[PDB]
Amino acid sequence: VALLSGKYPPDLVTNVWYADAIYPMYADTEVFSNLQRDMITCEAVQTLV
């Protein structure tokens, strides 16, 4: 059904649409947090051995 019934907005400009859509997403820092988590994980493994 999804394959047979796709539809776009009547007047779509892709660059404007995406500039509006993605902008809120890239204000987060969870990836920067996860990097610090991974560093500690590796430190713990080496300390254990």
Name residue 26's amino acid. Answer: Y
Q: CB 29 → another protein: shortest distance, Å?
A: 10
Q: CB 8 → another protein: shortest distance, Å?
A: 5
Residues that bind another protein (CB under 8 A): 1-10, 12-17, 19-28, 30-31, 34
The dihedral formed by the CA atoms of 35, 40, 46 and 48, expressed in degrees to the nearest 10: -150
Q: How far is CA 38 from CA 27, 33, 35, 41, 43, in A?
A: 21, 9, 5, 5, 9
Nearer CB in complex with another protein: 20/46: 20
Nearer CB in complex with another protein: 13/40: 13
